[PDB]
Amino acid sequence: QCVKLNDGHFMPVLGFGTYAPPEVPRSKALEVTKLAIEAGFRHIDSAHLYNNEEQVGLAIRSKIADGSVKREDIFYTSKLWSTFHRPELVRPALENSLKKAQLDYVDLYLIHSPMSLKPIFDIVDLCTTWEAMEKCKDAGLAKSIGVSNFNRRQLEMILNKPGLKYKPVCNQVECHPYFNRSKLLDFCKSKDIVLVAYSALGSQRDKRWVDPNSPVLLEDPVLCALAKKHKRTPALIALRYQLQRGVVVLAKSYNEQRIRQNVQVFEFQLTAEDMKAIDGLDRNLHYFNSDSFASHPNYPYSD
Ligand SMILES: NC(=O)c1ccc[n+]([C@@H]2O[C@H](COP(=O)([O-])OP(=O)(O)OC[C@H]3O[C@@H](n4cnc5c(N)ncnc54)[C@H](OP(=O)(O)O)[C@@H]3O)[C@@H](O)[C@H]2O)c1
Ligand SMILES: COc1ccc2cc([C@@H](C)C(=O)O)ccc2c1
């Protein structure tokens, strides 16, 4: 299934997450992105930060060359990293991501984070960063442009700026049953901005940012009980939850079985009572909980 964005392009509602930590060889991203596309994923989420755009791009070009898909069938996202917020650095950074992937355009280019870093924090008017993003859409470098990790206030700042040409099409944010972003999702729906959920399966629990004492989302007893009722798995319940909320959902897996499993989210439905039960789990838990974000002047979870 796809969703129609506010600029008239379409986004597949289930996306493949490609981040793996540096202990995973870079060659894995090539293999698993091919597996994802063979499984039926058509939306692939990457970023300059992930140090994998060469491999993810090759995987996409590999699947086109062999006839499985056409370029126009794939929705490829990359993200502008926080050391490149100054407007003069935006287009060169996007052109670098395109060169690494060996693609002519990205379907989606996002501001990865509102928290600017020296080109150690920076201060940058994100409205000027946005104006540079609009120019990248105009140039045809990106079909669509959006943001990531923005709160309501930061999103309004873009929506209210004088002479705005393009609204962000989405806001890709941490979102799952323990931090379900209900109020932000309502705001996004009011503005025809799609919410894209990352860490929808509870994150990779990487020690750099996630406390290992935090509860493990896929062990949640309500999710396990719904998995048992539907004869599915807790991951599938958590992905289907987002789709029935009107949220576009990413899922990372580097495991061949689980990659193929995750596309089963299209094969069943949760009832109103099941959705109410999952909505009940919300507990303001963001897994990314680190001094490196929390001390930033533009930390999104300040509101
Ligand atoms: N915009 C941002 O700032 C931002 C931040 C974080 C993430 N993201 C994007 O969102 C993507 C997804 O988020 P994420 O990487 O935190 O991971 P996730 O999608 O929350 O996945 C968490 C863990 O779930 C496991 N998993 C996947 N399918 C499963 C299944 N069917 N059953 C049981 N376990 C399963 C995976 O382990 P295996 O690999 O072992 O299957 C994965 O490591 C990222 O890869 C990246 O593309 C963006
Ligand atoms: C709250 O704000 C943020 C900002 C950037 C983030 C970047 C990542 C990277 C590692 C990613 O895209 O995977 C994760 C969490 C993040 C949270």
Residue numbers in the entry: 6 to 124, 138 to 321
Please, what does the article write about this entry?
Aldo-keto reductase 1C3 (AKR1C3; also known as prostaglandin F synthase, type 5 17β-hydroxysteroid dehydrogenase, type 2 3α-hydroxysteroid dehydrogenase, and dihydrodiol dehydrogenase X) is a human enzyme that catalyses the reduction of carbonyl groups on both steroids and prostaglandins. The enzyme forms an α8β8 barrel structure with a large and multi-cavity active site that exhibits flexibility at both the level of individual side chains as well as entire loop regions upon ligand binding. The active site contains a conserved catalytic tetrad consisting of H117-Y55-K84-D50 with Tyr-55 acting as a general acid and base, as well as the oxidised cofactor, NADP+, deep in the site. Non-steroidal anti-inflammatory drugs (NSAIDs) have been well characterised as potent AKR1C3 inhibitors.
Naproxen deviates most from the core structure in that it contains a fused 2 ring system and is then best described as a 6-methoxynaphthalene derivative. We determined the structures of flurbiprofen, ibuprofen, and naproxen bound to the AKR1C3 protein at 2.0, 1.8, and 1.9 Å respectively. In each case, a racemic mixture of R- and S-enantiomer was soaked into preformed protein crystals. In all three structures the protein selects the R-enantiomer, the opposite enantiomer to that which binds COX-1 and COX-2. The naproxen structure is unique in having a disordered cryoprotectant ethylene glycol molecule occupy the SP3 pocket – this location in the other two structures contains conserved water molecules that overlay the ethylene glycol molecule closely. The naproxen active site also contains an ethylene glycol molecule located similarly to the organic solvent molecules of flufenamic and mefenamic acid structures. A detailed comparison of (R)- and (S)-naproxen AKR1C3 complexes shows subtle differences in the protein-ligand contacts in each system. The (S)-naproxen molecule displays 86 protein ligand contacts with 8 active site side chains and the NADP molecule, while (R)-naproxen makes fewer contacts at 78 but with 12 active site side chains and NADP. These intermolecular interactions translate to different percentages of the ligand surfaces in contact with the active site; (S)-naproxen shows a 384 Å2 complementary surface with the protein out of a theoretical 429 Å2, or 90% complementarity, while (R)-naproxen shows greater complementarity of 95% which might explain the subtle preference of AKR1C3 for the R-stereoisomer we observe in our crystallographic experiments. An additional active site protrusion in AKR1C1 and 1C2 is His-222 - the site in our (R)-naproxen structure occupied by an ethylene glycol molecule.
